[PDB]
Design a protein around this nucleic acid. Structure first.
Lengths: 735, 716, 249
RNA sequence: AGUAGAAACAAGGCC
RNA sequence: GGCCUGCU
């Protein structure tokens, strides 16, 4: 007899055992080298899906741009980006009519937010493409570098501390004859108008790793800092709009998505009488981002912001204006090998414009030949369409408009449709009195989608009777069925620290028990395995064992020293008291009454040199990138113990010409620590104002010395010493 | 008027007033009389506060110039002259230290004698109105208020004047100096009434310059300016434009539904080529175990001593010789490496205490076997351009290979029971709730079912091997290291036992990226002759190292005993994911527990015990030439565990792609079997998407064969 | 005394003097987050990889003067080589366990008073009473429920001023809290935590967690109470219901 | 050789 | 041969 697990589906329905079809117990695919090939392929594919448009050359950037809008209507089922302006404007108008007051309200709240938003909001972001160094750097670092360059060039309106003023300075920089940047190898280099325009309109391309569910790798993009404020405002407007649309599912979580899917299916099927047939289409959109033209987003926003202050319209329109002229950096480059001479070489992507094509294979040779005409200063113009879901929410708005355009008031026919859209994925429930009606409805829905630059993937889509469908790895079969294979990768040690890892593991087990219908015995097994892996990872074994490690000696002496050994934490080699009933309690508090007072005091000592807290945002928040989803943050319950240390940093900056960044880091951190000691609320509430550091610090020294004498340790001798030391630092700052 | 503040007042005050001007964001060129008025207010604040000191008594000491001493205390300490944030900082600090009441508006000074605030304001109008005006602005105030006015008069409540009168003569002399100096200037046409409390501003975000031209090039094809396009949008109204283009659009743009029937789906085509080879990092079906029967636990003990003791338990060693060559390497290197390992093992046996971890010599043998100094040296392009052989890295579709029957048998025997328990679980909090007791009983049942399973043994082998390899790579980055493959089990009798499959030599492991490869050489004992399925051992070199005698009724077999030696490699990501193989247990048993719960939701009672003991219900878990064979729930547990283990062992992008694109077709087939009239828009496209994932991986090809068999058995 | 002294020492050196002079208060946050350290994409892989090194964690410089450089057998506990972009020094994990067996001891009696939420959870569970498990299909319907069982009927911003006035009374600024509920909360949490020396930031964070109301969408069947939602994993399942009554009731 | 698979590893750089 | 780094 030959064993075959798949035959199990002959008795258990597919959805009731779908977890077996998710090989999420092995290493996910990773990219190894350059992503330049993928970037070039994506650029060429985006440009050839809109080949029948019209070509122009921008007078500012001098780059060739392709406009397919209002182009010839498609005559085949292949992907097409020839969106029609009038059709999309009409779709938005119908969306407004079905939801009166949506645009005006959303614009009002967006106007409030834009005129009260601060610059620091831009620091709350992941890697961004700093143009000062032409590389990806943390959002805060890139923002600081750009602000420094602007201030050095004379653009100091951002000193007002307002994001709108920062954007005003950004736009004013566009009209400058010559800017100056700094490079280390420090050298001051001058950038002319066109070079700075291209550096501000460019995107950095990388390869996406840890992407499960496809054989081929893809490319993703990261924009600069000049354009992120406009993107933030536009996405704020789009989120405020989608929050008023029940057909959208992008700005919500997973459980809300499931609830809305259940509600829509029940509404569609229940209202349908015996005569009407119902069919569900589990649709995926092929080349979703490559076929969405930024000009059409400009049209949608300018229709949304009608009868609004002109400044609001301008600030919200700046973003799509820059995306329509966006450029993409090709990537890291290409690495060549010569086996005859036994050597390797790494050529940067910027040489692709001039480098001969003898080194490249046929596929890459043709890709380079096709993309060369669009190469301007080492970057390729990508006007026709978006690169990687930067306007997720606006795309969801367009999809929701398409979904609502079939409310049976615009169809003008017996058939009708509804459903749920989340960018690149949708479920469409279509009802009609007969199979011919369903066919006509789906055909018209597809045709209308093709008029908006949205394509339906026929290969990854199928239609059945309502009651069974899929949506973003959520399988609905007369009710959503748990999978538990999507969350399997999150059952190990997170990698934050000991206490954080313990709390995160127990909380993940608890949550997957609540949401993903994890069984009790399975949860106990998960707890046991997690504890085993945790002890084997942090070298913290039970203590009563003879497992020799680098940490087994101190742990054993602590074990033999303690009297009530049941109170020792698993991190210190103690027994595990966790169970299904204790999954919502931190380890420290669960073992508090069992700890010896000496060990308890040594553990939770504020003066410990290991605990370090930076800001209110990073107290008990851990960023865990979930499998098959975007990066997410979790609140984990933990007590600040000596085990809450933060791990070592990379330390490879020491071998790079960018070595002075570490000295600047140290000096900035010293100044920030001094300010915090002067202003204790610096971390919890970020200080605001327009004065400089030393003014506030010296003046508060004055006052605090005064009052702490009026009652406290200070003495006249010390108070006068502080006053004249303040005068000394004053005259020092003078010179 | 600004010429006056250019001339008279000192710098300190003028820049203080300029920063106060910047504070609330209004411009000085439009209205300057406010600047002069508030700078005079600030000046009176200084001149009233300075020159006034106190000592340990009350009765302020007044000195025209502060002498060098610790006695420089100031009688009145200023509030204004600071930012709003700091003004409120001082307010709150004084309230919290003085125990006084917090005012709602900005004071100007604080004093000790009377322990309270002073809000000085000198207005153009006479005092006896401005005083009570600001008083009714401030609610129930105990802070004393004192104001002057240009005529020279003073006033205050309580008839209180807090310090010397010569200072006030100073104040009013300053005051009339101001007055009869404007007399020379001539400003009272507006000086009395120049500020009325204007607060208004319009936000301006103007598109101009280059950024405007960009806006003119981001419009539909037949538009010339953003102004015109916005006007058109504002004037646009729906007039049935989607219908016109829908009618005009070609009818070939359709989404016709192709019915999906029993005869529609065709079997997935498998690639053809040379048979598929073995990819695992260790032997799974052909492993052999040398044991000692020690009482130590899994992690307890020292590796090298245990390995040597286990190997000394076997007698019959012969001089090794080549049986099956690598067919691409230098087998004599493998032979010499094996003999070197034996020699150095003896060398450890001789000395005092067995080292916890041993380093081996870097001979040419393992230099070749571990791929040392073979990475091409990195150079610059400007120095290597004329080399004809210089080209890209080989980037093409992997070699095509057809499925072989060995993977099927390997999976078959990976789901079989064993004579040992390969899982020793940790401790949990004592169960207190009845649901916890039910969970514990279920867990005990599953552990009894799966512990005696080759899948669990493979899990432990992989976890231990990858953990040791990762730790050695991170610790001994430079020097080759010896690691014996160790796994500890428990017999039916209950006696604990150790097992030594072989050895792993880890090489240079300077791993920077998650994809960087660490090469090692693995040696494993076995009894399976490699002359029967050679195509499964394409990358192995197999020697003959001894003879084994296992008790059998046919005299005694005296079988040969071979050594499978190969060069393999891994990476940080692969090591990390292989050291988390225990979640296969989770996956499998979560599936089984979901089955049990779903069935128990029907009958209002827990159904675990009868499922595991009666074994009445069975699921299709394989096909025999006679037909489909069904097994009890325990066999399903073992089968799913083996499937998860093989997923973790043979993981690859092909597996992910095939899994997704075959789950799609499985859902379609399930819809067909449920009588839900399934339909497809392009089924050939889906088939081509599935078939492109099957290239050379044995596991994915076996999964595809299983899928074809399931289709054949289904659709009936 | 000290604080202004390192201020003067910083201003002595030209670079830090320039940083202090030209940098405005508003930019405080930016430069504080200014770092070359990228946020890790795969934390688990490197935590499993770094812990195999010697000196894998980081600690303040003060550790060099509280913990000896080596333990009894000579295993090093800390190193004097500083981190990449900080003055902290890299140390071994043993320095943690050492601190828990011979490090300085204090009076942790006030931690229960600080971490009110967690200890209240423990007390509620310790006195809970379980019941029989009933096996029947549960119709889990998704609903919006409040998870925090100690929220004082305050929002984030609404309680943020209360938290500042409780911890940072001087940086409150204009705000003086009007609602009398906030008055009593301030009084209680002021007199209760008057000398607690854990940290201002952690105290503020835990006060925010305790007082601020927070809500999330979850699949529930029955219950719906704040105390009954924290144990939602233990009382409700796919095909079983476990009757439970927390200690509070 | 080996790992791996649309491009890489099989140490890097600095003296 | 000596020393530096391992997400920069």
């Amino acid at each position: 007899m030959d064993v075959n697990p798949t035959l199990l589906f002959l008795k258990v329905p597919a959805q009731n055992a779908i977890s077996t079809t998710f090989p999420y117990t092995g290493d996910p695919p990773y990219s190894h080298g350059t992503g330049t090939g993928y970037t070039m392929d994506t650029v060429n594919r985006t440009h050839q899906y809109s080949e029948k448009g019209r070509w122009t050359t921008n007078t500012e950037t001098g780059a060739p741009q392709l406009n397919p809008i209002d182009g010839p209507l498609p005559e085949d089922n292949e992907p097409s980006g020839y969106a029609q302006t009038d059709c999309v404007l009409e779709a938005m108008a119908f969306l407004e009519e079905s939801h009166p007051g949506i645009f005006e309200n959303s614009c009002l709240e967006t106007m409030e937010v834009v005129q009260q938003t601060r610059v620091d909001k831009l620091t709350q972001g992941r890697q961004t493409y700093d143009w000062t160094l032409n590389r990806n750097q943390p959002a805060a670092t890139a923002l600081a570098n750009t602000i420094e360059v602007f201030r050095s060039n004379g653009l100091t309106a951002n000193e007002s501390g307002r994001l709108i003023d920062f954007l005003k300075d950004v736009m004013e920089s566009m009209d400058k004859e010559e800017m100056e940047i700094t490079t280390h190898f420090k050298k001051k280099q001058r950038l002319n108008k066109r070079s700075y325009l291209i550096r501000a309109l460019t995107l950095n391309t990388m390869t996406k790793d840890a992407e499960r569910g496809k054989l081929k790798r893809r490319a993703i993009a990261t924009p600069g800092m000049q354009i992120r404020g406009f993107v933030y405002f536009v996405e704020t407007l789009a989120r405020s709009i989608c929050e008023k649309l029940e057909q959208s599912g992008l700005p919500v979580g997973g459980n809300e998505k499931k609830a809305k899917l259940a509600n829509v299916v029940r509404k569609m099927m229940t209202n349908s009488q015996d005569t009407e047939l119902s069919f569900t289409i589990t649709g995926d959109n092929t080349k979703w981002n490559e076929n969405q033209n930024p000009r059409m987003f400009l049209a949608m926003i300018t229709y949304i912001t009608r009868n609004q202050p002109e400044w609001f319209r301008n600030v919200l329109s700046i973003a799509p204006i820059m995306f329509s002229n966006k450029m993409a950096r090709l990537g890291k480059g290409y690495m060549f090998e010569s086996k005859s001479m036994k050597l390797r070489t790494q050529i940067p992507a910027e040489m692709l414009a001039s480098i001969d094509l003898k080194y490249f294979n046929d596929s890459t040779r043709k890709k380079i030949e096709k993309i060369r005409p669009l190469l301007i200063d080492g970057t390729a113009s990508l006007s026709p369409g978006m690169m990687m879901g930067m306007f997720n929410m606006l795309s969801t708005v367009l999809g929701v408009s398409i979904l609502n355009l079939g409310q049976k008031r615009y169809t003008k026919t017996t058939y009708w449709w509804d459903g749920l859209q989340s960018s690149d994925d949708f479920a469409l429930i279509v009802n009609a009195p007969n199979h011919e009606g369903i066919q006509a409805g789906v055909d018209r829905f597809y045709r209308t989608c093709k008029l908006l630059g949205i394509n339906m993937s026929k290969k990854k889509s199928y239609i059945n009777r309502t009651g069974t469908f899929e949506f973003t790895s959520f399988f609905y079969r007369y009710g959503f069925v748990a999978n538990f294979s999507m969350e399997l990768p999150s059952f190990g040690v997170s990698g934050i620290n000991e206490s954080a890892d313990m709390s995160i593991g127990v909380t993940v087990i608890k949550n997957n028990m609540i949401n993903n219908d994890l069984g009790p015995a399975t949860a106990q097994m998960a707890l046991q395995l997690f504890i085993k892996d945790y002890r084997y990872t942090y070298r913290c074994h039970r203590g009563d064992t003879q497992i020799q490690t680098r940490r087994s000696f101190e742990i054993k002496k602590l074990w033999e020293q303690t009297r009530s050994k049941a109170g020792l934490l698993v991190s210190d080699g103690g027994p595990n008291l966790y169970n299904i009933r204790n999954l919502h309690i931190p380890e420290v508090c669960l073992k508090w009454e069992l700890m010896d007072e000496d060990y308890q005091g040594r553990l939770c000592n504020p003066l410990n040199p290991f605990v370090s807290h930076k800001e209110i945002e990073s107290v008990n928040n851990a960023v865990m990138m979930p499998a098959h989803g975007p990066a997410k943050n979790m609140e984990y319950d933990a007590v600040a113990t000596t085990h809450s240390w933060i791990p070592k940093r990379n330390r490879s900056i020491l071998n790079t010409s960018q070595r002075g960044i570490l000295e600047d880091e140290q000096m900035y951190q010293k100044c920030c620590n001094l300010f915090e000691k002067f202003f204790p609320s610096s971390s919890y509430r970020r200080p605001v104002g327009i004065s400089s550091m030393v003014e506030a610090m010296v003046s508060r020294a004055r006052i605090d010395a005064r009052i702490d004498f009026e009652s406290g340790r200070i003495k006249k001798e010390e108070f006068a010493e502080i006053m004249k030391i303040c005068s000394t630092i004053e005259e020092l700052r003078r010179q | 008027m600004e010429d006056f503040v250019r001339q008279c007042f000192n710098p300190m005050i003028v820049e203080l007033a300029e920063k106060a001007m910047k504070e609330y964001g209004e411009d000085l060129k439009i209205e300057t009389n406010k600047f002069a008025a508030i700078c005079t207010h600030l000046e009176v604040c200084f001149m009233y506060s300075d020159f006034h000191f106190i000592n340990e008594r009350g009765e302020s000491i007044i000195v025209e110039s502060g002498d060098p001493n610790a006695l420089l205390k100031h009688r009145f300490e200023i509030i204004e002259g600071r930012d709003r944030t700091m003004a409120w900082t001082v307010v709150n600090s004084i309230c919290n230290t003085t125990g006084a009441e917090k005012p709602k508006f900005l004071p100007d000074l604080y004093d000790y004698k009377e322990n309270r605030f002073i809000e000085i304001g000198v207005t153009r109008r006479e005092v006896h109105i401005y005083y009570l005006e600001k008083a009714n602005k401030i609610k129930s105030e105990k802070t004393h208020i004192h104001i002057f006015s240009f005529t020279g008069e003073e006033m205050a409540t309580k008839a209180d004047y807090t310090l010397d009168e010569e200072s006030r003569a100073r104040i009013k002399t300053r005051l009339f100096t101001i007055r009869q100096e404007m007399a020379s200037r001539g400003l009272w046409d507006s000086f009395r009434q120049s500020e009325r409390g204007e607060e208004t501003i319009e936000e301006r975000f103007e598109i101009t310059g280059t950024m405007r031209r960009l806006a003119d090039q981001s419009l539909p094809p037949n538009f010339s300016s953003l102004e015109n396009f916005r006007a058109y949008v504002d004037g646009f109204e729906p007039n049935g434009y989607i219908e016109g283009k829908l009618s005009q659009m070609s009818k070939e743009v359709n989404a016709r539904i192709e019915p999906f029937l029993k005869t529609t789906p065709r079997p997935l085509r498998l690639p053809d080529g040379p048979p598929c080879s073995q990819r695992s990092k260790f032997l799974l079906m052909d492993a052999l175990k040398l044991s000692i029967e020690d009482p130590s636990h899994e992690g307890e003990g020292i590796p090298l001593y245990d390995a040597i003791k286990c190997m000394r338990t076997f007698f019959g060693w012969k001089e090794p010789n080549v049986v099956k060559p690598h067919e691409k390497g230098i087998n004599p290197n493998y032979l010499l490496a094996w003999k070197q390992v034996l020699a150095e093992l003896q060398d450890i046996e001789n000395e005092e205490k067995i080292p916890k971890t041993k380093n081996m010599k870097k001979t040419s043998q393992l230099k070749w076997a571990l791929g040392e100094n073979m990475a091409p040296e990195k150079v610059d392009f400007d120095d290597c351009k004329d080399v004809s052989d210089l080209k890209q890295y080989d980037s093409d579709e992997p070699e095509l290979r057809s499925l072989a029957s060995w993977i099927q048998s390997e999976f078959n025997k990976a789901c079989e029971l064993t004579d040992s328990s390969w899982i020793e679980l940790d401790e949990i909090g004592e169960d207190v709730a009845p649901i916890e007791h039910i969970a514990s009983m279920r867990r005990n049942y599953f552990t009894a079912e799966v512990s005696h399973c080759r899948a669990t043994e493979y899990i432990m082998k992989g976890v231990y091997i990858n953990t040791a390899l990762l730790n050695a790579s991170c610790a001994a980055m430079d020097d080759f290291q010896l690691i014996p493959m160790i796994s500890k089990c428990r017999t039916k009798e209950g006696r604990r036992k150790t097992n030594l499959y072989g050895f792993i030599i880890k090489g240079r492991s300077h791993l920077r990226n998650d994809t960087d490869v660490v090469n090692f050489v693995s040696m494993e004992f076995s009894l399976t002759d490699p002359r029967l399925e050679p195509h499964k051992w394409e990358k192995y070199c197999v020697l003959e190292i001894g003879d084994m005698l296992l008790r059998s009724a046919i005299g005694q077999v005296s079988r040969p005993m071979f050594l499978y030696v190969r060069t393999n490699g891994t990476s940080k990501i692969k090591m990390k994911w292989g050291m988390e193989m225990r979640r296969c247990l989770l996956q499998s048993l979560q599936q089984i527990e979901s089955m049990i719960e779903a069935e128990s939701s029907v009958k209002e009672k827990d159904m675990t015990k009868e499922f595991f003991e009666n074994k009445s219900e069975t699921w299709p878990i394989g096909e025999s030439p006679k037909g489909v064979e069904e097994g009890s729930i325990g066999k399903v547990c073992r089968t799913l565990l083996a499937k998860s283990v093989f997923n973790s062992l043979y993981a690859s992008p092909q597996l992910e792609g095939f899994s997704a694109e075959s789950r799609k077709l499985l859902l379609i087939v399930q819809a067909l079997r449920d009588n839900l009239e399934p339909g497809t828009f392009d089924l050939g496209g889906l088939y081509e998407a599935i078939e492109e994932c099957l290239i050379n991986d044995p596991w994915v090809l076996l999964n595809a064969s299983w899928f074809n068999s399931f289709l054949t058995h289904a659709l009936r | 005394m000290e604080r202004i002294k390192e201020l003067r020492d910083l201003m002595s050196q030209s670079r830090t003097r320039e940083i202090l002079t030209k940098t405005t208060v508003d930019h405080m946050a930016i430069i504080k987050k200014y770092t070359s350290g990228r946020q890790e994409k795969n934390p688990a892989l490197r935590m499993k990889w770094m812990m195999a090194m010697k000196y894998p964690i980081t600690a303040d410089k003060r550790i060099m003067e509280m913990i000896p450089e080596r333990n009894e057998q000579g295993q090093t506990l800390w190193s004097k080589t500083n981190d990449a972009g900080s003055d902290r020094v890299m140390v071994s994990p043993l320095a943690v366990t050492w601190w828990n067996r011979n490090g300085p001891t204090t009076s942790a009696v006030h931690y229960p008073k600080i971490y009110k939420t967690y200890f209240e959870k423990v007390e509620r569970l310790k006195h809970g009473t379980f019941g029989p498990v009933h096996f029947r299909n549960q119709v889990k319907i998704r609903r919006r429920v409040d998870i925090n069982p100690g929220h004082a009927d305050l929002s984030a911003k609404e309680a943020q001023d209360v938290i500042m006035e409780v911890v940072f009374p001087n940086e409150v600024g204009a705000r003086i809290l009007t609602s009398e509920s906030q008055l009593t909360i301030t009084k209680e949490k002021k007199e209760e935590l008057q000398d607690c020396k854990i940290s201002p930031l952690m105290v503020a964070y835990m006060l925010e967690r305790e007082l601020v109301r927070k809500t999330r969408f979850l699949p529930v069947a029955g219950g719906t109470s704040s105390v009954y939602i924290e144990v939602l994993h233990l009382t409700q399942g796919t095909c079983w219901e476990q009757m439970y009554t927390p200690g509070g009731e």
